[PDB]
Amino acid sequence: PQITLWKRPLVTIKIGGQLKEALLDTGADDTVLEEMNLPGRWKPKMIGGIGGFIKVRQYDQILIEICGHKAIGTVLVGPTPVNVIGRNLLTQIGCTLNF
Amino acid sequence: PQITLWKRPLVTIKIGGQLKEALLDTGADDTVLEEMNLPGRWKPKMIGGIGGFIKVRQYDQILIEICGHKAIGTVLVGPTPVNVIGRNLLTQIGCTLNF
Ligand SMILES: CCOP(=O)(COc1ccc(C[C@H](NC(=O)O[C@H]2CO[C@H]3OCC[C@H]32)[C@H](O)CN(CC(CC)CC)S(=O)(=O)c2ccc3c(c2)OCO3)cc1)OCC
């Protein structure tokens, strides 16, 4: 589809057997999701933006479905104020910017 | 143009007569630039990102050209980690997400 940017580009995602709302974020290198108790091993990471850095858990090879488009890659989990789908997954679903 | 997301969607912008590089950031409501001198009145504002809140200077009705497309809108100036073009200006240049 085509998503205009009058409002936040929020979509439903499926991850870890759960549905959530997440931002299609071209400014996010990585995908960052609200706290959730995913199974498996993880690695500590810190990511920064406006206001500073937060601590997150890095999970690799996680399956996410975005608007019916399947993707698999790294997902960071932590106390982020919003779920953001980053470029690592946006490329996998064929997402472009157009003007 | 159509812009893929394998790398950061960085583009050249023109503001206050000066050229800069900025990130097209669909996850940003607002446009936030690194510290710079801009002519005209401004008001102090606060904006929040993934790591907390920062203090910025708000400039209204500023001319800014983004990849050869003109916009006139609000530009926030402060200690952002990178120059970001937010949805307030992306809508003006007709930018959409497509997959
Ligand atoms: C419930 C209350 O919410 P809230 O207000 C905050 O909510 C939000 C809403 C959207 C975002 C997304 C963020 N947008 C943003 O900052 O926009 C601000 C300007 O316009 C306003 O619009 C929204 C906030 C304001 C960027 O799109 C992406 N970011 C990097 C970007 C920085 C600008 C470029 C470096 S990033 O998230 O940091 C990040 C993601 C993956 C990574 C990474 C860093 O590093 C590797 O991988 C983040 C928090 O709380 C305040 C305490």
Which DSSP state fits A29? Answer: S
Query: How far apart are the C-alpha atoms of B21 and B33, rounded to whole Å?
Result: 10
Query: Is B82 exposed, middle or buried, given 0-12, 13-18 or 19+ CB atoms closer than 10 A?
Result: middle
Q: In B, which residues are within 8 Å of A29 by CB distance?
A: 8
**In residues, how long is chain B?**
99
Is A1 within 8 Å of A49 (Cβ atoms)?
no
Residue A46: CB atoms within 10 A of its CB come to 12
Query: How far apart are the C-alpha atoms of B10 and B51, rounded to whole Å?
Result: 22
The domain limits of chain B are: 1-99
Q: Is the CB of B82 under 6 A from ligand 1?
A: yes
Nearest to A2 by CA among B96, B26, B38, B59: B96
Method: X-ray
Phi, psi (rounded to 5 degrees) for B28: -105, 125
- Report the nearest atom of ligand 1 relative to the CA of A49: 38
Q: In A, which residues are within 8 Å of B35 by CB distance?
A: none
Query: What's the sign of the alpha-carbon dihedral A49, A50, A56, A62?
Result: negative
